[PDB]
Amino acid sequence: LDPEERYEHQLRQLNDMGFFDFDRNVAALRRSGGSVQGALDSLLNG
């Protein structure tokens, strides 16, 4: 699956929280294993 499938529900949550950059969102989700909480931490830190 492409990440847009794979991470559909977590991309929505991230976008709903003001995180719109797709590449950054996907990168953060891959490092977190698909965890939104972890992705959010990455997106806020650095």
Side-chain angles (χ1 to χ4, degrees):
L1 302 165
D2 50 353
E4 282 146 70
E5 271 56 58
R6 248 249 293 285
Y7 300 120
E8 192 200 331
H9 301 115
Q10 37 268 87
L11 287 172
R12 211 218 266 248
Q13 190 148 212
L14 293 174
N15 282 268
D16 287 356
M17 294 193 88
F19 294 101
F20 305 133
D21 194 320
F22 172 82
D23 284 353
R24 286 175 82 265
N25 284 352
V26 168
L29 282 172
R30 307 229 301 98
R31 290 164 152 249
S32 77
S35 146
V36 156
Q37 224 69 322
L40 282 168
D41 179 78
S42 295
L43 291 158
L44 294 157
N45 294 251

